Amino acid sequence: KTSTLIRLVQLVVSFVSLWLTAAGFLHLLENSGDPFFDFGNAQHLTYWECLYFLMVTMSTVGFGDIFATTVLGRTFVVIFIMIFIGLFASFIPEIAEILGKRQKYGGSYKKERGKRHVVVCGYITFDSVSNFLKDFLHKDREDVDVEIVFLHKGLPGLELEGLLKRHFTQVEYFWGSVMDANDLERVKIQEADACLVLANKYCQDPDQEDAANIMRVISIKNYHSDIKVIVQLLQYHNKAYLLNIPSWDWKRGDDAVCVAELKLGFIAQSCLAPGFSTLMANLFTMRSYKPTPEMSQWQTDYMRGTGMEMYTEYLSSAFNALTFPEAAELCFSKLKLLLLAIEVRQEDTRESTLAINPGPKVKIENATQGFFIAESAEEVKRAFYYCKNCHANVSDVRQIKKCKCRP
Amino acid sequence: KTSTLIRLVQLVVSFVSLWLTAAGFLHLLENSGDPFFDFGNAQHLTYWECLYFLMVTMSTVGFGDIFATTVLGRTFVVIFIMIFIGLFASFIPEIAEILGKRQKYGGSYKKERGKRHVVVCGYITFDSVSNFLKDFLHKDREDVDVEIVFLHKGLPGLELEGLLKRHFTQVEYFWGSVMDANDLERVKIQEADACLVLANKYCQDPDQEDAANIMRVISIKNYHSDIKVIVQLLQYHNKAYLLNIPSWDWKRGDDAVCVAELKLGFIAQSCLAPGFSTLMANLFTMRSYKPTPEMSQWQTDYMRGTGMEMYTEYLSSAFNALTFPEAAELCFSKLKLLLLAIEVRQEDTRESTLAINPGPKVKIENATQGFFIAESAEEVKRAFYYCKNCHANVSDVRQIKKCKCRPEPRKFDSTGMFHWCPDRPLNDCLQDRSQASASGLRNHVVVCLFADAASPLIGLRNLVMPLRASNFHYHELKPTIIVGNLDYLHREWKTLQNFPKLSILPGSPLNRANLRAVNINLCDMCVIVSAKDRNMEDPNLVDKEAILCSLNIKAMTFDDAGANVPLITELANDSNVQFLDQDDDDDPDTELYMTQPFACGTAFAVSVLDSLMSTSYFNDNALTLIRTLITGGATPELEQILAEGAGMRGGYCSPAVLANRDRCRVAQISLFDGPLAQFGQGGHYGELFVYALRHFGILCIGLYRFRDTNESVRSPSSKRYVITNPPEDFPLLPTDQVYVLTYKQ
Ligand SMILES: [Ba+2]
């Protein structure tokens, strides 16, 4: 069911048929004889041997084992060579065109039983993926591994090919688009964990790119209506077009990331407090502390603070009926851990608006969620396992990491 | 007589001559001897054998039977190989170029004795031919087969090649143009039945394409002056340039099909009666009813009405001296057949103007022609063979198929068919949000226009002209408000200033403040049109604005609700209809006419109009009837008036002209609380039809019915679908609506 395959099979079948016809012609003309010599020079020649000889002659190689002694055989060989060279002169271009037509990056993704993947569509180039790939597949992240399935309408460049080859065990690529209900089955969106729509930050008209990304979101939500979508927008007024999509529910994970809003917000916060942009940019990126002797003292001091990230954790029962300043002081002094924000309304079930540095009025209740700044996720667990009675006399922070006499 | 052939024969002859010269050289140098050896090593060698050996050596193959023992022979062979390889290095490019020069699609068409063909010229691509080819070569059509001969200046693509191969037995292709008197003899226009000139609906400047098509028509009529031509135009003002051609006679079959006029007429008729666009689009396309078990009940009910077409037939002698209502009632009750229109003046020989649902005054005379809606052409024949005496006691309709024993200061136009107002400047109608909200607009029409400043004109006149017909009372006129770009409206206002009750709100339709000021929740129809240029990007990203506007209007909430706003969307690509409705199940190879948005009368695409070229060829009265239905007038006299460049003109009319204010119009009625509401409960379609025809003089075309079967609870998706001419035993519901053809205003 392919025109190229049909043409290829047609030409190969015609070539085989003509080759067999020529083999029969030579067999007859060699086993018959010569009218000039009254058929006194005919030489025995099997059909297989004649076919072998003609394949040798046609393949431009030429051997000296079988030759046409008969004059009729010689002139038939000359006609064979001339006609087949003439045909091959007008036959190689179509074959060359067809042999370089099948796309390299087809096929359908096959998922394992216990492996989750996220689909990454949109504007896939080297500069729009390198940082995202570096953060997504960072070594310092937890042991949970999730695959990445790029789905783009185009062929990757050289450096993108290098990135794909280096991450061969975690990254797959496919040719297609999110505008086709057929391409959304090759990447298994019905079972995908999330869909990430990237954008082109250096386009000519931001409105057109934003509309295209909104159309991609519309298509994805039209195919499957309960998947989590993270969109990358350019302008801020286009953030309201995503509320019109009936299946776009913010409460279940759908998010929109506005480039201009975040960038100018970082700059405007640097205006009020200089140096805040780098603080914010380093708190929200996965980095590891690897000091080297070639680094100056201030470089080491800065790199130590660079490697700290932000995490979330459920406060233990020891924080109940305790105000925010006391909880933060206890976390810093004992657990050596900084607490920024809390969940204030996890009890009344009203979306639990975040509270950043609340006053003494706010009190920690049961099963609240807090936000910590820590070097790694392991250190945050001490807040969950902290019991006041058993850990009263514990000095080293390496012992609080383990629970004690939990009910 | 070809330069390429001359070059080829020159090179092959030179090669043969050089080959023979080399053969002679080797023969002489081998049979002579060697001066160093005193000619003591010469070996006998015939000329034929030497020629064979040199052909083997030159052909890069190489055998080991004949070899040049002589040193002179060996050095001559070396020189031969070197010189001929050097020559062949500089000889293959020209040969390769020449061998790929002859065009594949030349030649002349040869016609059989009894086969007729139609020539199809113009803009031949895959998307402009697929629907036309599907309709023209439909299986359900009669046994008469006519060939198609495409004539284009270019090579077909891949999918066009596939179409040609699939229809190999009915379709031919040729390279040429209708601008050459030589190419019109290769396709035999002197014997062709008709010439179909297609257009490019998505061009950059419609005027240039229209002028090119007019030039093609001029050439075709210049070559042969008595051939039938069906032209496909884009704008409406170019329809008057075809009257200047001396050989263009409308009375003999020449026709012009205007894309914009028909499309905007369908939309404007949907504005008055929702869901009419799909009814009209399905009545004028060849379809077949092939139900499948996977289809839902409402899908089968809709597909049964989809398969009905329209035909013409001569009424039998039994209809003589019988008025139109009685004839229609007899046709429906006995023959199970619906009669729409009649020929009123076939006797006086005055072009026999069509009559749609005439009053009791009109009487059927001998040898009249009538128009029927029927599943197939066989059922229409019962009208011709119906004899009252012999078929009096015939119950089954399968026996009638065989014959038996046959022997107020109102200002209108000059034509008096449209409402007219004196010319005004644009600022006399321009408004802002405060002024628009001050005016309590309700039951109006809102046109959301996504136009640029330099975008080509749509011709919004064709959308407002049907809404100002003179058969509407001045208090029944629906106010129209256009929300869109302003510079485009400066360009467009030249053709709109004469229509009363029209307003413009500059801005953008995607803004919500405009839609709140316009009172879009109290309107009767919101038409989303886009004048922006088409097809510079992915085909799936050409209808961003329309889909975004539809979703924005649907998601909006008003104060007593935004999902009940009736709006009709115009699509550039027909594959985007999957993104309009959420409750439906999408599918990639489903035709547009079978989707849910189209079945409800919400989406419309110009592709469904591609089938209007074939029908106009097979039925010459179809275009007149469809224009009469979807335009509300526009007689050729009005076209002549507009062709003078002075614009629309008129005023107070004489009483003789004002007699044109009584033509029938398409309307929609409800079975809820009217005088005929008794058929809502337990009633059947046939009883309602005959009652309405006998009592009120109303002809019913079809039903417009809630999609959800549980209308008692009225599921949130309150969408309706259309059924065309349901059978006589169809059960009615109190919430169903009926399409009707009303008379006497
Ligand atoms: Ba770290």
Ligand SMILES: [Ba+2]
């Ligand atoms: Ba049919």
Ligand SMILES: [Ba+2]
């Ligand atoms: Ba859908």
Ligand SMILES: [K+]
């Ligand atoms: K070679």
